[PDB]
Amino acid sequence: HASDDEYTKLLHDGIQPVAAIDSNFASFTYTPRSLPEDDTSMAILSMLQDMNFINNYKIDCPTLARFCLMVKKGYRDPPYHNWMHAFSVSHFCYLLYKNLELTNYLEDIEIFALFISCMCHDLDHRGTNNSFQVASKSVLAALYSSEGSVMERHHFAQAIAILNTHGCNIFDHFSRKDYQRMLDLMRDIILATDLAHHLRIFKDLQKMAEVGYDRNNKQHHRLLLCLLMTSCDLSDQTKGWKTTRKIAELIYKEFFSQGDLEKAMGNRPMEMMDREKAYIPELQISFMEHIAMPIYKLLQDLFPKAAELYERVASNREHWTKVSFTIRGLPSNNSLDF
């Protein structure tokens, strides 16, 4: 019946200064997946403290601790879309904040919403995509299919359910106006994680980069938020070869698992979901050239200091070309360690 023991222990000695985590914690070279999972909740508090959102928005620490624990427990354990993914995506948001000086481009509340969105953007993911929800006529599909972005709307709904859980509403004291603004930002930012959305606004993103970002342009704020969210979501591609390789293993383990379920339903899965047809190296090269590289290229055109990011993504693409080892699907052991 010791309901408060868990969060109390987390805050026992206060919030740990971000500088004390790792001297390289705020560098683009840092790999957040290396941090022990049991230390991630405190790391979240550390980043929120460094960005000073707790002071700026008068956030209640105990409530925030409970909220962070709830978000972490809100993730299931599929190979890729788990808490460590949300954690690493959130860390990249922090990196962009520190390295690109986002406070000079976005309003403070927008950056706060972006970080919280990163934490909650994949809540309750089961390892299957939107196409599958519709094909299996799931309860989530029946609920959101009409509006599109089925899983994305579910993730947002789960985030709201957490805020509505006793003792977890970190925005409870907000005025009605600011509360609605925060929930609307979270909705729009999480919805931006749907690739379909990114592809639709891509030309608007290029135009903004072409004419130059304008802090007084409301549309630019919305567009930048979408680009940044996508940038955080695919940040595993900005690390070293070992990370890109490992993440590929996790994502395809998920993709092939879904593909197997589709075949069992009497359906024909897309090639990239079929372990008997997919050739991972080529699929990664395609992903890099058509999705990842263009996103970080845009980021570079807007932020010169983001060049090293685009550079790493391009390098990793090169690595895949030197790997393209010859079999389709994944090895018997489901590993690419070799």
Using CB under 5 A, list all residues that contact Zn ion.
122, 233
Residue nearer to Mg ion on the CB measure, 193 or 231: 193
Place of tokens 């957490």: 162
The encoded tokens of residue 111 equal 């950056």
Residue nearer to Mg ion on the CB measure, 45 or 248: 248
122 carries a ligand binding annotation: yes
Is 319 one of the annotated active-site residues of the chain? no
The encoded tokens of residue 34 equal 């290396």
Q: What is the DSSP letter of 29?
A: T
What is the C-alpha separation between 327 and 16, in angstroms, rounded? Answer: 47
**Is 275 in contact with 330 (CB distance < 8 Å)?**
yes
Stretch of 70-78, 187-195, 214-222, 305-313 contacting Mg ion, by CB under 5 A: 187-195
What is the C-alpha separation between 325 and 24, in angstroms, rounded? Answer: 34
Q: Crossing angle for the helix pair 108-120 and 176-191, nearest 10 degrees?
A: 50
The encoded tokens of residue 114 equal 């972006």
Residue 193 engages Mg ion in binding (rule: CB under 5 A): yes
Residue 122 engages Mg ion in binding (rule: CB under 5 A): yes
Which of Zn ion, Mg ion, none lies near 236, with the C-beta cut-off 5 to 8 A by kind? none
Residue 158 engages Mg ion in binding (rule: CB under 5 A): no
What is the C-alpha separation between 239 and 22, in angstroms, rounded? Answer: 17
Question: Which listed residue (1, 81, 91, 154) is catalytic?
Answer: 81
CB of 86 to Mg ion, least distance (A): 10
CB of 178 to Zn ion, least distance (A): 27
301 carries a ligand binding annotation: no
Which of Mg ion, Zn ion, none lies near 110, with the C-beta cut-off 5 to 8 A by kind? none
CB of 281 to Zn ion, least distance (A): 23
Q: What is the DSSP string of 225-249?
A: HHHHHHHHHTGGGGS-HHHHHHHHH
Residue 40 engages Mg ion in binding (rule: CB under 5 A): no
Give the binding-site size for Mg ion (rule: CB under 5 A): 2
Binding residue numbers = 85, 121-122, 233
Interface residues with Mg ion (CB under 5 A) are: 122, 193
Show which residues are catalytic.
81
